[PDB]
mmCIF file of C-alpha atoms in Angstrom:
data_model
loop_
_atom_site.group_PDB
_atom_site.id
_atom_site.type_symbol
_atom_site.label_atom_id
_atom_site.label_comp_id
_atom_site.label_asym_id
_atom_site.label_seq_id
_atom_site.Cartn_x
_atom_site.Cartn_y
_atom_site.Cartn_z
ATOM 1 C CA UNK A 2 7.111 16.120 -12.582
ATOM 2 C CA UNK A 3 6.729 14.923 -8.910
ATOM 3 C CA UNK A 4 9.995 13.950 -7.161
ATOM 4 C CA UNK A 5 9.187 11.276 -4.245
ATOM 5 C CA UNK A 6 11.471 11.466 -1.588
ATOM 6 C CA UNK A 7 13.448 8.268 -0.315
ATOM 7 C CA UNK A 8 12.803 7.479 3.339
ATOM 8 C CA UNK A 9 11.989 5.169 5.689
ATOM 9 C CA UNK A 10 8.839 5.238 7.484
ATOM 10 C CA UNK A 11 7.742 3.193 10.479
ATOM 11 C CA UNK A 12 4.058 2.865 11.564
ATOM 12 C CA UNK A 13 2.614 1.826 14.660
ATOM 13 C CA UNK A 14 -0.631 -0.226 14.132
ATOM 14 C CA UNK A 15 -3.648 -0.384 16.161
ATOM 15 C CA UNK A 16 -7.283 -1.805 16.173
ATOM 16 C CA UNK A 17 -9.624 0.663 14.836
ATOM 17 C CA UNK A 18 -13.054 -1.212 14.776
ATOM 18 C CA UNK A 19 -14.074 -4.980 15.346
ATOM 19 C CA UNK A 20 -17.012 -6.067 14.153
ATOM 20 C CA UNK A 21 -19.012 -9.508 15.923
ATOM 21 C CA UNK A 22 -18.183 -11.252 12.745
ATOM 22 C CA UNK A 23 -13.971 -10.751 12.714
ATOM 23 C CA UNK A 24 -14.029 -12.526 16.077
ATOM 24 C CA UNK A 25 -10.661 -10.075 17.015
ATOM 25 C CA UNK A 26 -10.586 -8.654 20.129
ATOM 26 C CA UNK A 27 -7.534 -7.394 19.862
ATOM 27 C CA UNK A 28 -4.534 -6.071 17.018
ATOM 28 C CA UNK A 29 -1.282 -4.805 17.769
ATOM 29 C CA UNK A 30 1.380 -4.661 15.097
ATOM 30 C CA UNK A 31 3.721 -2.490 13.000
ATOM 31 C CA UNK A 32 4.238 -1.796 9.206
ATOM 32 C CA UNK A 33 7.933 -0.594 8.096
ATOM 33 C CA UNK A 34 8.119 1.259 4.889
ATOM 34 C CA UNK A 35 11.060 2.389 3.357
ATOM 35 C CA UNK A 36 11.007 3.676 -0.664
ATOM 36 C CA UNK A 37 14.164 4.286 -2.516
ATOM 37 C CA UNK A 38 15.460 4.856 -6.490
ATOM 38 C CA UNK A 39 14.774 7.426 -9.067
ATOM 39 C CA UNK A 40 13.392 8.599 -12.698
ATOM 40 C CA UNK A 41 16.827 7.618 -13.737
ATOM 41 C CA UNK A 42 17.378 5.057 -11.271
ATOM 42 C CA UNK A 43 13.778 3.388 -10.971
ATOM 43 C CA UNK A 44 12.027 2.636 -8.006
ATOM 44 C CA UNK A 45 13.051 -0.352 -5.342
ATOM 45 C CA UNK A 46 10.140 -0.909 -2.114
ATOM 46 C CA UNK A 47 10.581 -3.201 0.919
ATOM 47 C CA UNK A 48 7.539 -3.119 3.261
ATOM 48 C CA UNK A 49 6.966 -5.334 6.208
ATOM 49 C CA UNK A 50 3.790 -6.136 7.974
ATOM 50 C CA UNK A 51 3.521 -7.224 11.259
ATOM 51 C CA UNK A 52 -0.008 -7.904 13.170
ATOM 52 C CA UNK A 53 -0.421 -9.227 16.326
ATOM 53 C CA UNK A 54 -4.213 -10.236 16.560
ATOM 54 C CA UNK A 55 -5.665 -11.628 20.161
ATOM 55 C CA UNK A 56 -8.754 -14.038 19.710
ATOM 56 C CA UNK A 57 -10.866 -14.932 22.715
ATOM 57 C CA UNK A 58 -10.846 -18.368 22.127
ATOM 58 C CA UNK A 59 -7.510 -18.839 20.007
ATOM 59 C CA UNK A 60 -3.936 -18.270 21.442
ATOM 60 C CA UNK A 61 -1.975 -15.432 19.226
ATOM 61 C CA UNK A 62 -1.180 -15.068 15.902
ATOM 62 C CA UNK A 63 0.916 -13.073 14.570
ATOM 63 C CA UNK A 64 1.056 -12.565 10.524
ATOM 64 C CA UNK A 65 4.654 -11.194 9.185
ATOM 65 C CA UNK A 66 4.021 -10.248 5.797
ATOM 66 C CA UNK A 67 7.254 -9.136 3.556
ATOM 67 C CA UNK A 68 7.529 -7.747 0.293
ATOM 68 C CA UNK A 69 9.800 -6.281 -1.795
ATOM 69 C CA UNK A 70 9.142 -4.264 -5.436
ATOM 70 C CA UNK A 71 11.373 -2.827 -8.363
ATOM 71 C CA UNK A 72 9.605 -0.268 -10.591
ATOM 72 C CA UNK A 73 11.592 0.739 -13.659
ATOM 73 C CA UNK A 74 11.794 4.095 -14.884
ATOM 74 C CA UNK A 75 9.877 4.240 -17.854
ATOM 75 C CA UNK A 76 7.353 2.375 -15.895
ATOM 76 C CA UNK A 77 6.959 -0.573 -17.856
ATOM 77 C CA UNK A 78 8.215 -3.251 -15.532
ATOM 78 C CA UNK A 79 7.455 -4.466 -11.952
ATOM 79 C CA UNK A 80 9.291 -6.864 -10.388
ATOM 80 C CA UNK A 81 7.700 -8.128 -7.123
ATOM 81 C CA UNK A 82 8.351 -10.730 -4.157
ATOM 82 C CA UNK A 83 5.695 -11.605 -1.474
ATOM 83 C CA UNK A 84 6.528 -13.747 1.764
ATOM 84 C CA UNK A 85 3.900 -14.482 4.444
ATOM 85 C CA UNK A 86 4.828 -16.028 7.768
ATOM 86 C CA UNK A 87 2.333 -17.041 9.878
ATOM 87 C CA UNK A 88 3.124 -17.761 13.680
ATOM 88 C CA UNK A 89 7.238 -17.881 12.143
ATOM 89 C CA UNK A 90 6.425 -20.178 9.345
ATOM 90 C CA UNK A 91 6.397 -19.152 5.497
ATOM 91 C CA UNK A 92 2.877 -20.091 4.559
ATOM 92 C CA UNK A 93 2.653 -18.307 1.697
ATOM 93 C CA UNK A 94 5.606 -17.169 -0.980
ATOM 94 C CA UNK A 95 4.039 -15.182 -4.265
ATOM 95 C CA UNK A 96 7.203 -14.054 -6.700
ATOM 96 C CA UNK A 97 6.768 -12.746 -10.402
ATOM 97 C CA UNK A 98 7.271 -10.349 -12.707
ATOM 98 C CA UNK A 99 5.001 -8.232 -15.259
ATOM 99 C CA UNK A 100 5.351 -5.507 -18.060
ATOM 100 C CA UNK A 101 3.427 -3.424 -19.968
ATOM 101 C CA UNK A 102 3.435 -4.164 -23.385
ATOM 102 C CA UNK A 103 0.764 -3.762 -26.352
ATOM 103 C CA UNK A 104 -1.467 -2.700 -23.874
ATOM 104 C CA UNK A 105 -2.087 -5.331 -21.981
ATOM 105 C CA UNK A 106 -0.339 -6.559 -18.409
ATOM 106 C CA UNK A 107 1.791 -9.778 -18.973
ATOM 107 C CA UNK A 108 2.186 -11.359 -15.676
ATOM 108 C CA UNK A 109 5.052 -13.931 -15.244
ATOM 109 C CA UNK A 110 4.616 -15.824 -11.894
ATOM 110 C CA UNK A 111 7.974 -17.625 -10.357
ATOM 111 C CA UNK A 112 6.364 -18.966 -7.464
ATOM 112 C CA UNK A 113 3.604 -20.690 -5.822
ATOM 113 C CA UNK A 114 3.519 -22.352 -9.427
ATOM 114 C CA UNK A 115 4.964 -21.508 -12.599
ATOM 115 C CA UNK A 116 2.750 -19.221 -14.955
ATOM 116 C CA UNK A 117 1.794 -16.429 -17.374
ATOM 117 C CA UNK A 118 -1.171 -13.879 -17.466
ATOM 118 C CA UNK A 119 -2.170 -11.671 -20.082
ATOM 119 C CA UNK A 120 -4.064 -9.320 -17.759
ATOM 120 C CA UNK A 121 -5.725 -5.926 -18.646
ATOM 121 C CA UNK A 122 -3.297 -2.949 -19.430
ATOM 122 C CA UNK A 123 -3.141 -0.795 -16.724
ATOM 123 C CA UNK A 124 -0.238 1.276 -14.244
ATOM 124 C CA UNK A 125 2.145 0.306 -11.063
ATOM 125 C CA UNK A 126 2.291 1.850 -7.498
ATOM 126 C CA UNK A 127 4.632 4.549 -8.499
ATOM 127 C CA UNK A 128 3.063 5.276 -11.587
ATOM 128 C CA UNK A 129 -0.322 5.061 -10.387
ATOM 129 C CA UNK A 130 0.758 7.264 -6.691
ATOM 130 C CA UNK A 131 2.518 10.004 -9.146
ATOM 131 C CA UNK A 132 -0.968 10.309 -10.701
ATOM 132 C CA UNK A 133 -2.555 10.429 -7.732
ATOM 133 C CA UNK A 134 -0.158 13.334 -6.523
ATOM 134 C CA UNK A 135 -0.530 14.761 -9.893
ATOM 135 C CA UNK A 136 -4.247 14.955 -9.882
ATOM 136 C CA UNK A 137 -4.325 16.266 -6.918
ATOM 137 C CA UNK A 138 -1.731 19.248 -7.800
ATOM 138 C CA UNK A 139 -4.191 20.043 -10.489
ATOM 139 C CA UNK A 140 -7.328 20.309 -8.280
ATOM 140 C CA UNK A 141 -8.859 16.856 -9.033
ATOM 141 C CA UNK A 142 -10.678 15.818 -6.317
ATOM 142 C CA UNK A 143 -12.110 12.213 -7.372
ATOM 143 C CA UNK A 144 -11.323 9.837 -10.289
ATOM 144 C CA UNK A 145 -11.393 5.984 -11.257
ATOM 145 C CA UNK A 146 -8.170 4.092 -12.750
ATOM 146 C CA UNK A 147 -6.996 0.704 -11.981
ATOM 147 C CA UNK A 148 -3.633 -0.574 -10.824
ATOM 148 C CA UNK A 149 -1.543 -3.998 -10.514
ATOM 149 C CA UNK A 150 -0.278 -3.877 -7.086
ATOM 150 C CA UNK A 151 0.738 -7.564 -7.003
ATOM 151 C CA UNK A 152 -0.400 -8.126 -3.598
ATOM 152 C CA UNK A 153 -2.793 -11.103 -2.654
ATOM 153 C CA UNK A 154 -2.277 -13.532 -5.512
ATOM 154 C CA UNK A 155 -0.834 -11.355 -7.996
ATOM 155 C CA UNK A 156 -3.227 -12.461 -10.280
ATOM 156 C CA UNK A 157 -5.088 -9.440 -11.738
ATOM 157 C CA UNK A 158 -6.136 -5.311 -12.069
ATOM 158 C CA UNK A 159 -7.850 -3.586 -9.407
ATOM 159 C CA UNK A 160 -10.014 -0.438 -10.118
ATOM 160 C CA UNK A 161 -8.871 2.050 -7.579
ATOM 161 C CA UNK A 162 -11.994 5.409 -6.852
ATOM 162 C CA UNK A 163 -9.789 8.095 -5.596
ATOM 163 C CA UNK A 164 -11.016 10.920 -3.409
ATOM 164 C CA UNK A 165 -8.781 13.877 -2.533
ATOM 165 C CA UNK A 166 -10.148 16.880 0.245
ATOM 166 C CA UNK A 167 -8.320 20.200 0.974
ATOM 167 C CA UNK A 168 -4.963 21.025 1.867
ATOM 168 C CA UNK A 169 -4.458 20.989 5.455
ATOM 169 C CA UNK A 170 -1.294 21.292 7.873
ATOM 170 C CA UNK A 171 -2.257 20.657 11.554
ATOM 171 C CA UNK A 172 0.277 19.730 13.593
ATOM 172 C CA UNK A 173 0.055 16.429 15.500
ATOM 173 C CA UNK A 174 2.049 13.717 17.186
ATOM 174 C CA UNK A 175 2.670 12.561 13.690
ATOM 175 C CA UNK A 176 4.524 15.552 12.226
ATOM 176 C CA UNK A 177 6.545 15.796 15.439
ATOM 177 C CA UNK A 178 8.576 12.806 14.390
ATOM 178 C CA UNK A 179 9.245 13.901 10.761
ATOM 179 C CA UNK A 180 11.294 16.979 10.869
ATOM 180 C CA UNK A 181 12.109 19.426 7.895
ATOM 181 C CA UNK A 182 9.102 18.569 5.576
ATOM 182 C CA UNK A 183 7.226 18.694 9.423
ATOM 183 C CA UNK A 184 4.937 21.571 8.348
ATOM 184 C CA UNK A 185 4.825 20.737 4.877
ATOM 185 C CA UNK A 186 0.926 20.538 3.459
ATOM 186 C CA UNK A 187 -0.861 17.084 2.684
ATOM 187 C CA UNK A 188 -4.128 16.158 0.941
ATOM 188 C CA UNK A 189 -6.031 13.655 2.661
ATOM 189 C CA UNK A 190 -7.058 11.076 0.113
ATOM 190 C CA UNK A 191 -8.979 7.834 0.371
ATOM 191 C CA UNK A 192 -8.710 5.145 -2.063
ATOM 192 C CA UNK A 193 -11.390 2.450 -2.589
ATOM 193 C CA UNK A 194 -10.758 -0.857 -3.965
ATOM 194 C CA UNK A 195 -12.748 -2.716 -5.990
ATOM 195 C CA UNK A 196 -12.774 -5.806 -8.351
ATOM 196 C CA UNK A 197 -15.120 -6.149 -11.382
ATOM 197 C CA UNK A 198 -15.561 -10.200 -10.226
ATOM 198 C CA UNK A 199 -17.920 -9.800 -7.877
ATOM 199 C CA UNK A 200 -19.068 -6.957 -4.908
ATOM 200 C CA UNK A 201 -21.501 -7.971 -1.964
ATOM 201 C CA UNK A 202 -22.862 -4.932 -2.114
ATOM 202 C CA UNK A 203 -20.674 -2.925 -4.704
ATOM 203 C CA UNK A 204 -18.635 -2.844 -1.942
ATOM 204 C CA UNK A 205 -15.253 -2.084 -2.466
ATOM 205 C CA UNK A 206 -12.818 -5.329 -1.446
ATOM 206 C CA UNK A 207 -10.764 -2.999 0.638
ATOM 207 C CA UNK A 208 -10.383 0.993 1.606
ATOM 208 C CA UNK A 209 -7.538 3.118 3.051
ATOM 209 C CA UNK A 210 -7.665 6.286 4.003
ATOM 210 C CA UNK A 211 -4.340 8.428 4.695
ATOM 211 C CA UNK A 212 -2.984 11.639 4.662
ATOM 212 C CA UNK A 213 -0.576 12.450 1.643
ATOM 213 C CA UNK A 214 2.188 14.260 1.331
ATOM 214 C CA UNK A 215 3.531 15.912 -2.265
ATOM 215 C CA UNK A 216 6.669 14.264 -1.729
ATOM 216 C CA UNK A 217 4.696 10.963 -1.689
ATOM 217 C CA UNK A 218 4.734 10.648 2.248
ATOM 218 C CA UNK A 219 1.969 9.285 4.366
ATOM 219 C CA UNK A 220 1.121 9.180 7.621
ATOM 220 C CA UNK A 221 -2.914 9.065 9.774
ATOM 221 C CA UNK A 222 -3.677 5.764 7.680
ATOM 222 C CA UNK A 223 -6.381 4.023 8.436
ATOM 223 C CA UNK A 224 -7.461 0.852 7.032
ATOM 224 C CA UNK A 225 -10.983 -0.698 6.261
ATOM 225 C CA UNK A 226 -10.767 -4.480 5.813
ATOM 226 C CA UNK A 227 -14.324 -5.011 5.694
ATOM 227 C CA UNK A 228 -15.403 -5.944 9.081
ATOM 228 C CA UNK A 229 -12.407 -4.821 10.765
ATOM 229 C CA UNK A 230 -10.130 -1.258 10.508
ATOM 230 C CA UNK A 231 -6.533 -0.905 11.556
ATOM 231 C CA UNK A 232 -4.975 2.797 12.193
ATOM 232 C CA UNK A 233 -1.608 3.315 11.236
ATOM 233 C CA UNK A 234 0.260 6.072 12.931
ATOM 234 C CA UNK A 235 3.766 6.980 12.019
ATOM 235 C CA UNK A 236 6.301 7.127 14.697
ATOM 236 C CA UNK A 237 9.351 7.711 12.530
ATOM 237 C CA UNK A 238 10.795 8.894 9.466
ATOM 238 C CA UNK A 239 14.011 9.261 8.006
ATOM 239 C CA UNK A 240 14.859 11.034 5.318
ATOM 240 C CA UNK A 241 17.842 10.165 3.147
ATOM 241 C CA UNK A 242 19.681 12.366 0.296
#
């Protein structure tokens, strides 16, 4: 029973960390969000990702990365498109579909080549967020699940270790830009990733950490690639009916 809010949310990225190994000395870049549809409607997300990272040696590059999701209502489908440009040319194109059906994830790829996956049965991003809001309503403070995000190759289920800490509401240059749900409360929440295949160190493939509103709103996100983090701020939100 969690109503997220449709809105479009715009985040300024910056370098949080480079390690000796990444070789970056320097990221600049942006990350558009907006999130629209309903119970009755379903869900429809278009993201971009934009990262302008410096090298010594190298001259820029900047990665453009553009997706676009439908979620239906019951939440048994997930339709999916993912476009990559590097330096202004589409490198990379990843387009499919998948459903949940006898408990299992069928995955039906359009594009780079032409196949089917019978994956393990798991949730979508607006499922698998609406639990995470849920859980957190309800006091839970850490849990395991898995999810099929379809990002990277589209090509399998991720476990996903939540952990959720108090309720807090302090005001920052963040909530500034966001208006009426301004002095709302959020949960900060950090979800690892990790894949069964194989873990350097059982170390999860990826971690975020963000602060969450109920409405499904986030802002203070931070990302941990591995050797290098990126900070998202948000620097603009609108809200629409």
């Amino acid at each position: 029973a969690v109503r997220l809010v449709p809105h479009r949310a715009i985040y300024d990225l910056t370098l949080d960390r480079a390690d000796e190994k990444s070789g970056i000395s320097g990221l600049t870049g942006r990350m558009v969000y907006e999130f629209n549809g309903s119970a009755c409607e379903g869900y429809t997300t278009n993201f971009r990702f934009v990262t302008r990272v410096d090298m010594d040696e190298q001259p820029q590059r900047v990665t453009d990365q553009q997706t676009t999701t439908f979620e239906d209502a019951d939440g048994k489908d997930f339709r999916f498109v993912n476009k990559t440009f590097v330096d202004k040319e589409l490198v990379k194109e990843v387009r499919g579909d998948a459903k949940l059906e006898d408990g299992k994830t069928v995955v039906k790829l359009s594009k780079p080549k032409e196949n089917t996956l019978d994956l393990k049965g798991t949730q979508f991003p607006t499922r698998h967020m609406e639990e995470l809001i849920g859980k957190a309503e309800a006091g839970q403070k850490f849990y395991q699940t898995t999810l099929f995000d379809a990002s990277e190759d589209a090509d399998r289920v991720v476990a996903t270790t939540v952990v959720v800490g108090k309720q807090q509401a302090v005001p920052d240059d963040e909530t500034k830009v966001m208006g009426k749900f301004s002095k709302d409360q959020v949960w900060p929440v950090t979800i690892a990733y990790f894949d069964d295949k194989e873990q350097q160190d059982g170390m999860p493939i990826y971690r975020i950490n963000f602060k969450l509103y109920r409405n499904g709103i986030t802002r203070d996100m931070t990302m941990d690639y591995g050797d290098f983090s990126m900070r998202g701020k948000l620097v603009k939100l609108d809200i629409y009916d």
